[PDB]
Write an enzyme that holds these catalytic residues in place. Structure first.
Site, short mmCIF file in Angstrom:
data_model
loop_
_atom_site.label_atom_id
_atom_site.label_comp_id
_atom_site.label_asym_id
_atom_site.label_seq_id
_atom_site.Cartn_x
_atom_site.Cartn_y
_atom_site.Cartn_z
N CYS A 151 0.86 -1.23 -0.10
CA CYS A 151 0.15 -0.27 -0.01
C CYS A 151 0.89 1.23 -0.04
CB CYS A 151 -0.77 -0.06 1.19
SG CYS A 151 -1.51 -1.43 1.94
N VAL A 155 0.02 4.90 -2.77
CA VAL A 155 -0.34 6.07 -2.39
C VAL A 155 0.55 7.22 -2.68
CG1 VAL A 155 -1.11 7.71 -0.40
CG2 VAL A 155 -1.97 5.14 -0.68
S1 CLF Z 1 3.07 -3.11 6.87
FE1 CLF Z 1 -1.63 -3.73 1.27
S2 CLF Z 1 -3.24 -5.22 1.79
FE2 CLF Z 1 -2.11 -5.28 3.81
S3 CLF Z 1 -0.54 -6.87 3.22
FE3 CLF Z 1 0.37 -4.80 2.56
S4 CLF Z 1 -0.07 -4.87 0.55
FE4 CLF Z 1 -1.27 -6.31 1.41
FE5 CLF Z 1 1.81 -4.34 8.07
S5 CLF Z 1 0.08 -2.53 8.40
FE6 CLF Z 1 -0.54 -3.73 6.61
S6 CLF Z 1 0.92 -5.45 6.96
FE7 CLF Z 1 1.38 -1.84 6.38
S7 CLF Z 1 0.13 -2.66 4.77
FE8 CLF Z 1 1.80 -4.22 5.46
S1 SF4 Z 2 -2.21 13.83 -2.41
FE1 SF4 Z 2 0.05 13.17 -2.19
S2 SF4 Z 2 0.85 14.19 -0.14
FE2 SF4 Z 2 -1.47 14.01 0.01
S3 SF4 Z 2 -1.87 11.88 0.94
FE3 SF4 Z 2 -1.40 11.62 -1.42
S4 SF4 Z 2 0.62 10.80 -1.68
FE4 SF4 Z 2 0.61 12.05 0.18
#
Ligand code: CLF
Ligand code: SF4
Ligand SMILES: Nc1ncnc2c1ncn2[C@@H]1O[C@H](COP(=O)(O)OP(=O)(O)OP(=O)(O)O)[C@@H](O)[C@H]1O
Ligand SMILES: Nc1ncnc2c1ncn2[C@@H]1O[C@H](COP(=O)(O)OP(=O)(O)OP(=O)(O)O)[C@@H](O)[C@H]1O
Ligand code: CFM
Ligand SMILES: [Ca+2]
Ligand SMILES: [Mg+2]
Ligand SMILES: [Mg+2]
Lengths: 476, 268, 522, 268
Positions: C152, C156
């Site tokens: 993730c 983002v």
């Molecule tokens: S560190 Fe996003 S659905 Fe979740 S396993 Fe991810 S690719 Fe799949 Fe920890 S808080 Fe969760 S397991 Fe952050 S995202 Fe991984």
């Molecule tokens: S618009 Fe950009 S600065 Fe805002 S949460 Fe998304 S990745 Fe982060």
């Protein structure tokens, strides 16, 4: 084997490009039975080097995985995408009683299941409708802990506010717990974030409510996630020693049980790495002394059974001895049965933040000398408890990587090894007896007296099992 | 078919400068598209005629998932057969607009929006705040980048700051700074001023654009200056910017300058 | 207490009266638990038709999925290409889960690495870790290739994997010629099956897009075989066996089989088998590409048909009887080789088992779930055997899919009593087996709880769980069986008839009560 | 201790107007702090005297984790005993600044940067693009917000666009709009145009700020107008703005206007 580990370590590290090279060389050092700081000997709790096969987790594994997950009368919402939630459903073996789905919701998984748009438009609005659907579809839920995920941390949603609104609205406790994966160097932060998260939204709500009676014996088991029953295997001894076990934190825990910790006479801590933080606020805000104990094996439990006794009156002490006398014949019986088979067999370990040092004693009793250990998220103050429990010129690792570990195993050549699921196979393939330590490899309780029994038997069925002799085919 | 990404410091003149440039480009009989990579959603408002139409992200919210959307729903024909689309986005203080930009460009690419014989694809990118807003300048997106600037200390700090972040995508990729476009400080020592920075950067100053209030007469009357007042002074100016761009072949890799050399310039 | 020669573990121990006492005191003492009366009540409630509508009107909370994120489906794809390294750009705990998970199912090693993106990463983007990580990993575990993925965290913050990779190259961390494919794998989008597409296609490109100019369609006269997210090794093996015993040339693009099954003989093998790049490189020169599970390889097809210019066949997952002859027939249409008398026998041997087992299987109402191709497959074959596929759930399915399945149900009369369910999680199916009760369930280990919950209601309401799919943690070595084609269909069938036969033996083994129907032979 | 956030459209005058206002607030013998919730990192450069010191997110990267930082490293005293901290941020097209804003704010609050003896905590927030940039206006952050604006159609569209995103945090929280600050954009009806919009909004026009070039002199020289030329015409202006702010009691809940009533205004 004095200068060996050094000719072993920098030979293993030899492969590492200079950036990672310097770094790792400081995470693994030879153990001198007498130093009381690891800042001169070894380092821990720093960032992990990229692309290396770490076992370290994230802040999520610590807050929804180890700390909150376990509260059986609450509904822990995995806030964020779908993966996490469905990767930890029933992963941890913290046992509990109740009617899952109706009263309890631990082997269950609730997720806000983030979609493309939830991320774009951010979503507390989805969190509110979701905190609503539980109250309606799961009436007996007694509170909701909202465990955050990476996205929530970046998108910056006020999961802190909603939990105040819905909850102050639904008249139910909601814990805006923040456990974003990108946070911290390991799972550790999750603990510290959990602990505090508790002292904020759950702990302090029974503060001016004295319909309770503090007995000079009332206590709480803090830091026993009851993997396999360990919490029960220990809650039994204390109670058979006369103490009154009032609370158990995470491990068949009750949200209310957590709320009565402040009115106890003593906080018993088995996990000095997870609830150490809280046990201090537990004492500076409320003023309730706490201590560290160990229930791995006869000599540790027996010993501890007395420490927790002296913190009370002689009354409980003579009673304590009665408990020790009772199990004395049983555990003696075990050793006389197994030690003969485990004697001299050495063992190599690698865990999280407590067992790495805490299991050795359970071994000493069986005569399996430990020639190597490591943690994946401990701090120096965790190694400070280790050096002593260890022999001199034993190899220790911190956040050890595949190459780092695998090479030590390949050279030190242990009879038995104990680590996690990610590692359980690599060595089983090298014909080296492996016994899961995290999940106890789906075995029975290890803590306490009854526990020690199974342990002493689990090392035997695996270490001396027939499989091993059958690895290299005859013609070869 | 070239795709150029227009950048700049919010409030110096990206959208007008763009819509007008393509409006002119449209005048030249060119197949153009204006991808609006800005949460404001005004990147097309001057060629389509209105506040703004149904955006990609806003629209995809209705269908539940973006994969449910159809290029027909967001893509609309406007002035001189110019095609428009908006990346959409959240509201001030919620969500991730840097995401929409990604979702939106992926969608366009995904639904074969680059399918019909287009000659130009203009990405009107807002603030270059994070990773998503760099979307337009990867591989397969835009190769030419036209940073907008002015004679202000901070308008150049940006033009400089922007090209700086471009060197990452420019080295590893093929995207390049085609030149700066100036929307002046009245021409009072700026006509040449920017040219200075254009050199220290290693690019050219493609064209200088005036401060003509005909842009407000158009802006407030919901249209471009090229449709509004075809022969106005700044109507040809925008035609120039369009013509220079078309024939422009100078695409370089930006050479950022330091605060010290930056302020050194204005100072002199 | 514990007695040495008869050690009671987790379950016998806490049953002892000494422990029961304890738990009661904990319960009545500090749990402030509701009285069984209302607990039983709330339960009694959830198991109703009133609760179900409430359940389904649901639109924000999700209870117990039937999908995973994309990065997990990517990693499995990668494991397939020879000596490659599942590389995941982002957090490190993600891969720690991706791994742990794939372990419990296959129960062999699962190698995968990650650029541990710490907090700073989110704030400054993730350039160095990608740069270094590519170097460190490539230096330590010595791959031939590294296929970058993303948690993730990178999505983002929109790290451009492409750029990030190329800088590292130019910046001199990894040999510019070192294969390093990539694919953004938004865990918050699609599902795990989707990751497999993005991950695959990524690679299908890295070795072809640039070289398209000199390849001829059908230059090696072979047939490409794209599996997709598949976790039953028996299926990889069985598909290779058939083509192979047909004398048909082929190339299994993405082949986990050796690597997910490395013999324990004393030597650890981080890699084994796999699809060679030189093989993936030459892909376009084949006659045509076949997609075993099109429903999550939709992005692959777009590429293969588009860039390779392959006239991709309109086949469904090779499951059950009809969809297999069709698979083979088409392969026969392409390769040139005929359907071997060998395979024809096999078929007839399967139809034999059907006629032979048809009685027990006829009319058995089932509830099932899994991936879009699997369920569409299984369901089909269930109609062939003559069972009613009552409740069909597919959590990661879509509209075009749902209505393709409905139609497959519109054909047979055994299918006119079944409903499809997409975007609905397990907790929904818990209701469906209560309001309109099956016979059995056919899913993963997660369906172990829907089973339990049916029993608490009444033994005469319990719905046994037949484990076919993924995951399967509470059982051992099922990962080695097959669910595709004739072979894997011989099994599916036996597994039910005997799944039914067993129940009838349990329902009827009460002495002088139900044991009268305890026929010695059935 | 009051905490006010200052928002506006990039390129209209946040930082200078803020630094000068606190510069003036310092002159008044007030304990003030400037939290730089902007990636550019210039929110303090005029009070501290340089390009910019070591920021929170940039510093914390050095220590591997933010938990390793010390308030002592980011917080530096400047003119008139004014405290200054920067949130830090990535470069153009990479990373997430909306996160820095968060990590940086949580840090200051965490490390007890407020459990000090301040009277005014000013949050210089840049573009309100997404969620994290909304940090300075939750519960426990800023209660007073002073949207800066000018006589331009697009400068008001933002003053209005901003207050809109405010009503969200305003209704559920305690934050409120205190009044608009007009920093001259040179129109003719700068005095009334704004005041008008200030009324249709339900707020006041706290003060009007001249287009004096003493600020380029101060800007390019690396300092505020208050320390640069203490008696310059606009030195008292900024003092005015500061004074009015201090005594200001008017904090309302905005009431956006529509494009149509907006353009109606200018057209008038
Ligand atoms: S560190 Fe996003 S659905 Fe979740 S396993 Fe991810 S690719 Fe799949 Fe920890 S808080 Fe969760 S397991 Fe952050 S995202 Fe991984
Ligand atoms: S618009 Fe950009 S600065 Fe805002 S949460 Fe998304 S990745 Fe982060
Ligand atoms: N030639 C010009 N002379 C003077 N002002 C102009 C000129 N062209 C445009 N403007 C003014 O610039 C302001 C902003 O223009 P535009 O819409 O292009 O903004 P922008 O900064 O590119 O927007 P964004 O960054 O949000 O994409 C408007 O008020 C507009 O009237
Ligand atoms: N009325 C004015 N008084 C002083 N300077 C002005 C005025 N109008 C414009 N300027 C000049 O315009 C620039 C804008 O000032 P400032 O540094 O506050 O930028 P900004 O665009 O508000 O910052 P940000 O958008 O990053 O918050 C400076 O060069 C400033 O001196
Ligand atoms: S690896 Fe315990 S500090 Fe934590 S899940 Fe295991 S060695 Fe954890 S004792 Fe515990 S119950 Fe555990 S075994 Fe402290 S709780 S993050 Mo994996
Ligand atoms: Ca195995
Ligand atoms: Mg614009
Ligand atoms: Mg500023």
């Amino acid at each position: 084997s004095r200068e060996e580990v050094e000719s072993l370590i920098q030979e293993v590290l030899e492969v590492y490009p200079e950036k990672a090279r310097k770094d790792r060389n400081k995470h693994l050092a030879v153990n001198d039975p007498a130093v009381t700081q690891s800042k001169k000997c070894i380092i821990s709790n720093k960032k992990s080097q990229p692309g290396l096969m770490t076992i370290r987790g994230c802040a999520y594994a610590g807050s929804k995985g180890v700390v909150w997950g376990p509260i059986k009368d609450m509904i822990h919402i995995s806030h964020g995408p779908v993966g996490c939630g469905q990767y930890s459903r029933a992963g941890r073996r913290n046992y509990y009683i109740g009617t899952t789905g109706v009263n309890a919701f631990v082997t269950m998984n609730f997720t806000s299941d983030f979609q493309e748009k939830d991320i774009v438009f951010g979503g507390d609005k989805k969190l509110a409708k979701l905190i609503d659907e539980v109250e309606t579809l799961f009436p007996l839920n007694k509170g909701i802990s909202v465990q955050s995920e990476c996205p929530i941390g970046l998108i910056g949603d006020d999961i802190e506010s909603v939990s105040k609104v819905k909850g102050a609205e639904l008249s139910k406790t909601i814990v805006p717990v923040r456990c974003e994966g990108f946070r911290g160097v390991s799972q550790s932060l999750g603990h510290h974030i959990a602990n505090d998260a508790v002292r904020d939204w759950v702990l302090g709500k029974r503060d001016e409510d004295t319909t309770f009676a503090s007995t000079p014996y009332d206590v709480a088991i803090i830091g026993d996630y009851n993997i396999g029953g360990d919490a029960w295997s220990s809650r039994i001894l204390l109670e058979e020693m006369g103490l009154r076990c009032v609370a158990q934190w995470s491990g068949d825990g009750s949200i209310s049980e957590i709320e009565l910790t402040p009115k106890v006479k003593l906080n018993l801590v088995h996990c000095y790495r997870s609830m150490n933080y809280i046990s201090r606020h537990m004492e500076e805000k409320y003023g309730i002394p706490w201590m560290e104990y160990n229930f791995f094996g006869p000599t540790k439990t027996i010993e501890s059974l007395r420490a927790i006794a002296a913190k009370f009156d002689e009354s409980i002490q003579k009673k304590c001895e009665e408990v020790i006398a009772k199990y004395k014949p049983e555990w003696e019986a075990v050793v006389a049965k197994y030690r003969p088979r485990l004697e001299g067999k050495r063992v190599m370990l690698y865990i999280g933040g407590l067992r790495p040092r805490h299991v050795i004693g359970a071994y000493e009793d069986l005569g399996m000398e430990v020639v190597g250990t490591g943690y994946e998220f401990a701090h120096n103050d965790d190694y400070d408890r280790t050096m002593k429990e260890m022999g001199d010129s034993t190899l220790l690792y911190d956040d050890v990587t595949g190459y780092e570990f695998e090479e030590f195993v390949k050279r030190i050549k242990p009879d038995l090894i104990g680590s996690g699921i990610k590692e359980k196979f690599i060595f089983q393939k090298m014909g080296i007896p492996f016994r899961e330590m995290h999940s106890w490899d789906y075995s029975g309780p290890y803590h306490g007296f009854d526990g020690f029994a199974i342990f002493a038997r689990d090392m035997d069925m695996t270490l001396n099992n027939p499989c091993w002799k059958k690895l290299q085919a005859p013609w070869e | 078919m070239r795709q150029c990404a227009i950048y700049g410091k919010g409030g110096i003149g990206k959208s007008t400068t763009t819509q007008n440039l393509v409006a002119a480009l449209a005048e030249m009989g060119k197949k153009v598209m204006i991808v609006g990579c800005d949460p404001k959603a005004d990147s097309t408002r001057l060629i389509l005629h209105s506040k703004a139409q149904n955006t990609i992200m806003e629209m995809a919210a209705e269908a539940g998932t973006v994969e449910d959307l159809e290029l027909e729903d967001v893509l609309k024909a406007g002035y001189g057969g110019v095609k428009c689309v908006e990346s959409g986005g959240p509201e001030p203080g919620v969500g991730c607009a840097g995401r929409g930009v990604i979702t939106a460009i992926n969608f366009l690419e995904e639904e074969g929006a680059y399918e019909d014989d287009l000659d130009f694809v203009f990405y009107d990118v807002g603030d270059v705040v994070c990773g998503g807003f760099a979307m337009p300048i990867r591989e397969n997106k835009a190769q030419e980048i036209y940073i907008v600037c002015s004679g202000e200390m901070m308008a150049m700090y940006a033009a400089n700051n922007i090209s700086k972040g471009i060197v990452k995508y420019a080295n590893s990729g093929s995207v390049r700074l085609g030149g700066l476009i100036c929307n002046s400080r009245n021409t009072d020592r700026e006509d040449e001023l920017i040219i200075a920075l254009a050199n220290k950067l290693g690019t050219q100053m493609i064209h200088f654009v005036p401060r003509d209030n005909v842009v407000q007469r158009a802006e407030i009357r919901r249209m471009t200056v090229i449709e509004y007042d075809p022969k106005a002074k700044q109507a040809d100016e925008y035609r120039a910017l369009a013509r220079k761009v078309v024939d422009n072949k100078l695409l370089v890799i930006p050479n950022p300058i330091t605060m010290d050399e930056l302020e050194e310039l204005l100072m002199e | 207490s514990q007695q040495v020669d008869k050690i009671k573990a987790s379950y016998p121990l806490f049953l002892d009266q000494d422990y029961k006492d304890m738990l009661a005191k904990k319960r009545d003492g500090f749990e402030e638990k509701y009285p069984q009366d209302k607990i039983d009540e709330v339960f009694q409630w959830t198991t109703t038709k009133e609760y179900q509508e409430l359940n389904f009107q649901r639109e924000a909370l999700t209870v117990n999925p039937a999908k995973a994120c994309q990065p997990l489906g990517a990693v499995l794809c990668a494991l397939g290409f020879e000596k490659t390294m599942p590389y995941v750009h982002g957090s490190q705990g993600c891969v720690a889960y991706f791994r742990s998970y794939f372990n419990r199912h296959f129960r062999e090693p699962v190698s995968c690495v990650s650029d541990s993106m710490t907090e700073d990463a989110a704030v400054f983007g993730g350039q160095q870790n990608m740069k270094d990580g590519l170097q460190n990993c490539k230096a330590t575990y010595k791959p031939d290739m590294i296929a970058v993925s993303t948690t993730c965290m990178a999505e983002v913050i929109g790290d451009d994997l492409n750029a990030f990779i190329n800088n590292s190259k130019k910046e001199g961390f990894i040999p510019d010629e070192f294969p390093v494919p990539f694919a953004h794998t938004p865990s918050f989008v699609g599902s795990h099956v989707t990751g497999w597409d993005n991950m695959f296609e990524g690679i299908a490109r890295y070795f072809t897009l640039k070289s398209m100019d000199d390849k001829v369609v059908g230059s090696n006269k072979k047939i490409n075989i794209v599996p997709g997210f598949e976790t039953y090794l028996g299926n990889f093996r069985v598909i290779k066996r058939m083509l192979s015993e047909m004398g048909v040339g082929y190339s299994l693009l993405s082949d986990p089989e050796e690597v997910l099954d490395t013999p324990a003989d004393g030597q650890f093998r981080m890699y084994a088998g796999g699809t060679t790049q030189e093989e993936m490189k030459d892909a376009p020169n084949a006659l045509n590409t076949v997609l075993l599970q099109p429903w999550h390889l939709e992005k692959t097809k777009k590429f293969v048909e588009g860039t390779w210019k392959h006239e991709v066949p309109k086949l469904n997952i090779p499951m059950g009887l009809d969809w297999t002859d069709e698979f083979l027939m088409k392969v026969s249409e392409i390769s040139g080789q005929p359907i071997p008398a060998s395979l024809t026998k096999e078929r007839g041997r399967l139809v034999d088992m059907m006629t032979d087992s048809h009685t027990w299987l006829h009319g058995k109402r089932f509830a099932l779930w899994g991936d879009p191709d699997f369920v569409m497959g299984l369901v089909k074959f269930l109609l062939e055997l003559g069972c009613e596929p009552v409740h069909i759930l597919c959590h990661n399915g879509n509209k075009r899919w749902k209505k393709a399945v409905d139609a497959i149900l519109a054909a047979s009369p055994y299918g006119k009593n079944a409903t499809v369910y997409i975007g609905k999680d397990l907790w929904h199916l818990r209701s469906l087996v209560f309001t309109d009760k099956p016979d059995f369930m056919i899913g993963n280990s997660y369906g172990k709880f829907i089973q339990r919950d049916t029993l608490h209601k009444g033994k005469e309401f319990e719905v046994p769980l037949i484990r076919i799919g993924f995951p399967i943690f509470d059982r051992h070595h099922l990962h080695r069986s097959t669910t595709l084609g004739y072979e894997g269909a011989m099994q599916i069938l036996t597994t039910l008839v005997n799944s039914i036969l067993e129940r009838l033996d349990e329902e009827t083994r009460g002495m002088q009560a139900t044991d009268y129907n305890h026929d010695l032979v059935r």
